[PDB]
């Protein structure tokens, strides 16, 4: 409007609908659909199955962290001097404990997420928040004062961030095209494509 | 490459060229689609390269022969 | 394309001559020969850039028409 | 199978680089020699060659003088630039003879 | 004289704590070799990993960030003992 | 068949010996024996000239270069022997893990010919021969300075 | 039952072991720079042998050309690396002890 | 035989210039301007497209600041390797071109070190060499397995993608750049942190070498940004900035946005030229601002192309990460600006050799308005 007399923006009729018009005459899709593996892992029906399918990721991350710390300890120890102690006995707890703690935290998160979703019966943000909060509570069992408040918050926030930018964002902005005519405005006289642009072939790596 | 070791061409050059010709004939707008259409030619090239079907057939024949012999 | 490429280029050449003088600690008016050379070269380069951009715009219009974009006469007018 | 016999003296061979294209225009010469290509170079191209040679002589002298070897640099730069531009012009003329590129003037001049 | 921030701790105790970083330093090539090797093998393996939910991925990233130990931390606390 | 098997199995022992030995001079000697075993493996696949190439470039020339460097930089590396039983089994385990269950293909035999190899190198594949020559020139210029 | 299948499996095991021994051998058992470059050569030789094996399997010349390329590049890389090692050793300060043994 | 002549001309040109420089070697002309000009003219014979013309521009600008016949010859060798990398059709072309470029880097690094700088330069060159050998050996071993299994050498494979990831220096394969480029000369680090990238981007775009995985660019973006913020030394700040940006660029290039990466590499080259060849505080400030992405400079256009490409793919996680990582990087660039004009009096060497530096600063300031059409 760019005036001071009437409200800015506009209004669209709710009664009047515009019949959908295809973006192009022929649509070629270079985006592959989700794999059967993805759907299997995503299935939260059985909490135990869901947990056991998704823990490998947490275990791997714990193993990488433990390997990192163990290597740092091993690198410093001197080869030239003989050591009374056994290095593996010193280093094995590091890796084992890190992997176990990571797996336990990821198990708690996955279990609570599946159990809440089943009990509630709906896929919602709350399920992620309560799983994160429970994981952060387990993380901060014996930590000083600030940490009990901070970790349940950071952990609860992480599934919120994942849901907003991993699931809601793409579905929200699926229609936008970028070529031909703007999604909403097809009356405007813009070049109309016979086929959609294919910027890349479907990936295979 | 495609060249042979002693002369001529590789042992399975012709099968690959057959598959490439099939892909050239196809009108699919993406390479993935054309490979899907020409998959049978690729299966022939892979079959000539490794002889996997013949190896399986021989394994089954040998195994049955052993079963008959033991009986 | 751009109808102000020549003017822009001349002013930018001035920007080069003054900036080079200032960076080296000399005053803007020093080395007068540099000013003419910079102005002319920048003007020509700006013009050349505009033709290059136009040429690749037309190449793109040809390509999109070949692909199947049903560009109208007015659209074919947009790309000089 | 049986090894195919090979003739050592006549073993099939090919150049490394190949242009994958069917001749759009008439083929005045299927396999032009260097001299045939040079003889078909247009007058404008020779003018470009001479302008390049002069410009590179002047630039070579200018750059060489800072190192006290102006004449030597000028001659080397001239020769180098003339040679490269001449090879480019001969490649273009050979492509025209082969029918890959437009040869209207070429066919008319040498029937 | 101007008002200045109070520094917690005694001067000699803080300097002693700072001096625990002055230890034989390993070369970083040893760490890099292993990281390059395992990283190459990891990239090859990653193509075959199952597709994970975004939420699980983010949680794994959080856990990895929390469990990552800075190289300086191990360096200061490293003791050559059982 | 026994000889081919023995050479194939030996190449592993000759590779393990290089890393295990603590003397840099001795490691080169084991590497030279490994190179000869590789020449003999190549002979079983039907290559004669290629196996000659490996021995010429590596045994004939590269090993000499390694010896020259080792003599000039000679250090005292007979400090201590750290080949504890625990370390060796861990190494052999890592090796076994990496070298297990990969795709295997039937052993082939292929007669090679220099006439075809030379023809291809200097006709159809001339681009490679000249880039390799440029690489050698780059190495010559950089090493000599 | 098939000698070639057995021999192919043996070859695959051997070549893979030689590759891992070259790439990770000198780093695992901490050695001098000269041993690292020798094990790197061992690894490159293993890969070139794999290419020659493939060329024999497929009756193709591509592996023989990749393998000659490996021989050339590997020798150039070794010569340059050894030059760097000598230059590094000639500049060592008196305090430095195992200058060549970075992994110590 | 005529197609071969095009390639042959480059070799003949290089050899004749080499032997002329060798014959005419004298103290009177240590800076062989004439040979530099001959090399520049020679490299015009390899321009076939726009990417080749960008390769020529960057190589010529790099050649200007090298001193002596030897360094300029090795830059021409680098150019030849880069030209062949773009044209590589299979594993052999990729391996050969990249390893030749690695050899040229090893020589250029070695011949630009003083006797007092040999201890650290040769160590960093050796560490680069050994890491390069790991990368090349894993590449060739996997390539051999692929060639055996498939019978053909196809440049569309995971093996090449991982190798080109190492060459770009993203994800965990960026440490060689940090170790080598910290101990080498400023010009060598600048020319080998920008020019090589163009060839790899061209190979990826033309040979369809893209993966569905976004982890490596996300990692490079976050690691680079956090490491840039925590780095005390200024060389490390500049080195980690390239890691972060090339991670984001890798993510954009996988999705098919070739034009934006080719425009980015050119702007990044011009932006990095003035910071690396530091002589004037003002030139360095304008460079840091362009790398940062401030809107009045050409650096803004380069960053804008990448960010604009990101919003098209509609991946939320990448956009969020990009915003936060960019802020963290901005803090490091502010540190750089603070160090020059807000910490202590600054005195720098009077190295009055600003060949293309004034032109680059001008091109950064002035170029924003002409290139506004792209974004
Ligand atoms: C924009 C959007 C972006 C998109 C794209 C952007 C585009 C990208 C690319 C664009 C690039 C732009 C930025 C880069 C700018 C280039 C750098 C630059 O500016 O110059 C660097 C460079 C830096 O010089 P420097 O800072 O002093 O350092 C060099 C050292 O001296 C080192 O010394 P040296 O040993 O190396 O000496 C070599 C050199 C360097 O030597 C020198 O520079 C010394 C000074 C040269 C002599 C003085 C020049 C004489 C006339 C100049 C006119 C000035 C007018 C001002 C006052 C009016 C006086 C009446 O000598 C030369 O000058 C070679 C050229 C030959 C011409 C010499 C003069 C010939 C006689 C006059 C010709 C015609 C007379 C007509 C009228 C005459 C009077 C008006 O400047 C030059 O080299 C000058 C080149 C030419 C001199 C002027 C000639 C102009 C012709 C006369 C005017 C007539 C109108 C012009 C139109 C018709 C032409 C005939
Ligand atoms: C046997 C060999 C030993 C190695 C073991 C394995 C060998 C490698 C095999 C495979 C390697 C590939 C994958 C490994 C990770 C990739 C990184 C890499 O390889 O670079 C080379 C790297 C060395 O490179 P460098 O350039 O020499 O060192 C640069 C640093 O400055 C180094 O200097 P610095 O360490 O002294 O400084 C560390 C600095 C460096 O900074 C970083 O680490 C940046 C990384 C941040 C995130 C990375 C991207 C995350 C995306 C992951 C993608 C997958 C998920 C997909 C979606 C997730 C969306 C984000 O960070 C810190 O200051 C410590 C904090 C840790 C992260 C900071 C973020 C905290 C946020 C949490 C919020 C909670 C606080 C709330 C309360 C606060 C109160 C106010 O080598 C390694 O570190 C490998 C060690 C493997 C341990 C990683 C642990 C988990 C791995 C996956 C989790 C992903 C998060 C990454 C966390 C830490 C990674 C460094
Ligand atoms: C005078 C007429 C010029 C107008 C047009 C130019 C075309 C005709 C060329 C005529 C020559 C003028 C040179 C101007 C352009 C250079 C291009 C070129 O030359 O080749 C193109 C031309 C054909 O390729 P094409 O036109 O690009 O189209 C091919 C396909 O379309 C595939 O190619 P494509 O990549 O173009 O595909 C279309 C592309 C769309 O691509 C585009 O839209 C390109 C946009 C144009 C940007 C221009 C900037 C590029 C920087 C290079 C500067 C030129 C250096 C000159 C080098 C050669 C010197 C002659 O779509 C894409 O998505 C691909 C991405 C492309 C890259 C993204 C563009 C961003 C570039 C970076 C900009 C970032 C800003 C940084 C700073 C900006 C500050 C203002 O090749 C030739 O005609 C023959 C080449 C012969 C050159 C030398 C031979 C003569 C001498 C022989 C012997 C030499 C030795 C003796 C020496 C003699 C002197 C001493
Ligand atoms: C105006 C048309 C004709 C101009 C006459 C030139 C024709 C000669 C043929 C070409 C020779 C090279 C052209 C000269 C340009 C650069 C030469 C140069 O570098 O100038 C000086 C030094 O460098 C400079 O002073 C820079 C000058 C830059 C150019 C200024 C001249 C402007 C016009 C000349 C070229 C215009 C076109 C040339 C023909 C197309 C050279 O120093 P010395 O090697 O010691 O030679 C001097 C001889 N002696 C001392 C023994 C008496
Ligand atoms: C950046 C590139 C890196 C890699 C480049 C690989 C691509 C270049 C590969 C070629 C290298 C040079 C090989 C010669 C190139 C072109 C071929 C040629 O011109 O030879 C002529 C031979 O033709 C001739 O004109 C003979 C005289 C040649 C005289 C010199 C021309 C070639 C000079 C090569 C430069 C090498 C000389 C020393 C190097 C300074 C063609 O061969 P034919 O047609 O089979 O033989 C003639 C028979 N007939 C015409 C009847 C069909
Ligand atoms: C549409 C354009 C916009 C797109 C941008 C890309 C296209 C580029 C267009 C313009 C390019 C201009 C490049 C500017 C370079 C600046 C000139 C330069 O660098 O000169 C150097 C040259 O230095 C040299 O090394 C000279 C060696 C070679 C000289 C030039 C070679 C000429 C070869 C022929 C080039 C013609 C191109 C061939 C066909 C296209 C002199 O500086 P120094 O003396 O070293 O130090 C300066 C000291 N101070 C400023 C502080 C006073
Ligand atoms: C950058 C965003 C990060 C959040 C920052 C918040 C402050 C961090 C403190 C940590 C706390 C954990 C994160 C909680 C934020 C979510 C907001 C709570 C609101 C809420 O509980 O409703 C849920 C939906 O909200 C939602 O989950 C969607 C709301 C989106 C979050 C807010 C977006 C803007 C915040 C940015 C403010 C400033 C940015 C600087 C950080 C339930 O929904 P339901 O579907 O489950 O219904 C129930 C049927 N069972």
């Amino acid at each position: 409007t760019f005036n001071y007399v009437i409200p800015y923006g506009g209004s669209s009729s709710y009664t009047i609908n515009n019949e959908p018009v295809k973006a192009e005459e022929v649509t070629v899709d270079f985006s592959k659909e989700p794999s059967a593996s993805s759907l299997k892992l995503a299935d939260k029906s059985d909490w135990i199955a869901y947990t056991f399918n998704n823990v490998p990721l947490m275990a791997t991350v714990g193993l990488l962290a433990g390997a990192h710390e163990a290597f740092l300890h091993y690198e410093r120890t001197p080869i030239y001097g003989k050591r009374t102690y056994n290095i593996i006995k010193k280093l094995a707890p590091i890796v084992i404990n890190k992997t176990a703690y990571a797996t336990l935290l990821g198990a708690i998160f996955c279990a609570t997420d599946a159990l809440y979703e089943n009990y509630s019966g709906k896929k919602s943000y709350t399920s992620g928040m309560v799983a994160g909060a429970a994981t952060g509570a387990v993380f901060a069992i014996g930590r000083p004062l600030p940490q009990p408040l901070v970790w349940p918050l950071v952990f609860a926030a992480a599934p919120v961030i994942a849901d907003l930018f991993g699931e809601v964002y793409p579905e929200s902005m699926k229609s936008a095209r970028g070529y031909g005519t703007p999604y909403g405005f097809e009356n405007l006289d813009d070049a109309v494509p016979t086929r959609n642009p294919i910027r890349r072939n479907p990936h295979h790596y | 490459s495609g060249f042979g070791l002693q002369s001529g061409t590789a042992r399975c050059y012709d099968w690959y060229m057959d598959y490439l010709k099939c892909m050239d004939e196809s009108k699919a707008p993406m390479i993935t689609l054309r490979k899907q259409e020409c998959s049978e030619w690729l299966e022939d090239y892979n079959e000539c390269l490794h002889r996997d079907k013949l190896k399986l057939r021989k394994l089954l024949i040998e195994r049955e022969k052993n079963k008959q012999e033991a009986a | 394309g751009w109808e102000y490429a020549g003017t822009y280029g001349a002013l930018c050449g001035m920007v080069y001559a003054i900036g080079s003088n200032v960076i080296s600690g000399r005053a803007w008016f020093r080395r007068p020969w540099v000013h003419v050379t910079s102005v002319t070269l920048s003007y020509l380069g700006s013009k050349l850039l505009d033709e290059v951009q136009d040429t690749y715009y037309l190449e793109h219009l040809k390509r999109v028409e070949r692909k199947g974009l049903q560009v109208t006469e007015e659209h074919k007018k947009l790309f000089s | 199978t049986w090894p195919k016999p090979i003739n050592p003296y006549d073993v099939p061979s090919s150049p490394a680089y190949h242009r994958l294209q069917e001749p759009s225009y008439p083929v005045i010469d299927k396999d032009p020699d260097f001299w045939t290509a040079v003889s078909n170079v247009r007058k404008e191209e020779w003018g470009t060659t001479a302008a390049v040679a002069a410009g590179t002589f002047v630039m070579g002298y200018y750059l060489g003088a800072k190192g006290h070897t102006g004449k030597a640099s000028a001659y080397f730069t001239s020769f180098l630039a003339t040679k490269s531009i001449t090879l480019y012009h001969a490649y273009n003329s050979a492509d025209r003879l082969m029918g890959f590129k437009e040869n209207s003037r070429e066919v008319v001049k040498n029937v | 004289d101007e008002p200045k921030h109070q520094i917690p701790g005694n001067a000699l105790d803080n300097w002693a704590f700072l001096r625990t970083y002055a230890k034989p330093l390993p070369d970083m090539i040893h760490y890099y070799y292993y990281v390059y090797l395992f990283g190459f093998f990891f990239v090859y393996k990653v193509a075959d990993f199952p597709e994970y939910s975004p939420r699980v991925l983010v949680m794994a990233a959080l856990i990895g960030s929390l469990f990552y130990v800075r190289r300086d931390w191990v360096h200061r606390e490293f003791k050559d003992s059982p | 068949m026994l000889l081919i098997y023995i050479m194939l199995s030996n190449i592993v022992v000759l590779a393990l010996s290089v890393v295990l030995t603590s003397s840099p001079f001795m490691a080169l000697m084991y590497s030279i024996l490994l190179y000869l075993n590789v020449q003999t493996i190549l002979w079983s696949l039907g290559y004669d000239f290629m196996a000659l190439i490996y021995a010429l470039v590596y045994v004939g020339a590269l090993a000499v270069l390694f010896l020259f460097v080792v003599m000039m930089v000679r250090i005292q590396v007979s400090t201590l022997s750290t080949k504890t039983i625990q370390s060796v089994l861990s190494w052999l385990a890592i090796i076994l893990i990496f070298s297990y269950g990969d795709v295997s293909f039937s052993f082939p035999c292929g007669a090679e010919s220099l006439l075809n190899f030379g023809t291809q190198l200097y006709s159809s594949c001339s681009d490679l021969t000249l880039l390799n020559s440029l690489a050698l020139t780059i190495a010559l210029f950089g090493s000599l300075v | 039952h098939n000698d070639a299948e057995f021999l192919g499996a043996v070859y695959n095991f051997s070549i893979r072991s030689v590759f891992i021994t070259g790439i990770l051998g000198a780093v695992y058992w901490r050695r001098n720079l000269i041993t690292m470059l020798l094990c790197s050569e061992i690894a490159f030789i293993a890969c070139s042998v794999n290419f020659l094996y493939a060329s024999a399997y497929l009756n193709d010349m591509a592996g023989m050309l990749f393998s000659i390329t490996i021989t050339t590049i590997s020798a150039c890389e070794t010569a340059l690396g050894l030059a760097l090692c000598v230059g590094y050793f000639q500049s060592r300060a008196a305090n430095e002890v195992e200058a060549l043994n970075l992994l110590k | 035989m005529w197609e071969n002549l095009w390639y042959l001309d480059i070799l003949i040109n290089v050899l004749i210039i080499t032997i002329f420089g060798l014959i005419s070697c004298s103290s009177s002309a240590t800076k062989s301007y004439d040979l530099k000009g001959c090399f520049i003219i020679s490299m015009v014979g390899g321009v076939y497209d726009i990417p080749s013309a960008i390769l020529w521009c960057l190589a010529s600008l790099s050649i200007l600041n090298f001193n002596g016949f030897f360094a300029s010859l090795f830059l021409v060798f680098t150019w030849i390797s880069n030209l062949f990398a773009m044209q590589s059709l299979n594993f052999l072309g990729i391996y050969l071109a990249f390893e030749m470029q690695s050899l040229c880097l090893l020589v250029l690094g070695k011949i630009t070190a003083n006797e007092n700088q040999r201890w650290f330069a040769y160590r960093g060159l050796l560490k680069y060499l050994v890491l390069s050998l790991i990368a090349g050996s894993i590449f060739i071993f996997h390539a051999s397995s692929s060639y055996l299994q498939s019978g053909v050498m196809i440049s569309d494979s995971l093996v090449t993608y991982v190798f080109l990831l190492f060459k770009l220096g993203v994800a965990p394969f960026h440490m060689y750049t940090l170790e080598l480029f910290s101990v080498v000369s400023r010009h060598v680090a600048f020319v080998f942190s920008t020019l090589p990238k163009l060839s790899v981007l061209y190979l990826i775009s033309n040979s369809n070498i893209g993966s569905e995985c976004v982890w490596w660019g996300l990692i490079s973006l976050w690691l680079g940004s956090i490491s840039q913020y925590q780095s005390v030394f200024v060389r490390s700040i500049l080195l980690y900035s390239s890691v972060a940006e090339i991670g984001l660029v890798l993510l954009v290039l996988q999705e098919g946005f070739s034009w934006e990466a080719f425009s980015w590499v050119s702007i990044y080259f011009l932006s990095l030229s003035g910071v690396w060849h530091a002589n004037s505080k003002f030139v360095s400030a304008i460079s840091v601002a362009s790398i940062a992405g401030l809107p009045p400079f050409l650096g803004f256009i380069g960053k804008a192309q990448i960010l604009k490409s990101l919003v098209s793919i509609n991946l939320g996680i990448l956009i969020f990460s990009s915003i936060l990582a960019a802020t963290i990087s901005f803090i490091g660039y502010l540190r750089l600006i603070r160090l020059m004009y807000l910490v202590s009096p600054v005195k720098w060497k009077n190295n009055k050799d600003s060949s293309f530096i004034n032109w680059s600063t001008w091109m950064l300031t002035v170029g924003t308005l002409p290139m506004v059409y792209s974004v």
Side-chain angles (χ1 to χ4, degrees), chain F residues 21-32:
Chain F
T21 187
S22 67
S23 182
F25 179 74
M26 269 296 326
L28 192 69
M29 290 338 278
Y30 290 141
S31 296
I32 289 147

Side-chain angles (χ1 to χ4, degrees), chain C residues 5 8-10 12-13 16 26 31-38 40-46 49, chain D residues 62 66, chain H residues 359 362-363 366-367 370:
Chain C
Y8 191 59
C12 296
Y16 188 78
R26 323 181 288 252
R31 292 180 177 177
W33 45 94
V34 178
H35 291 247
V36 298
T37 300
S38 303
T40 55
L41 271 69
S42 67
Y43 158 78
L44 291 168
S46 179
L49 182 65
Chain D
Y62 171 81
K66 298 179 176 67
Chain H
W359 180 82
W362 177 74
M363 211 67 231
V366 171

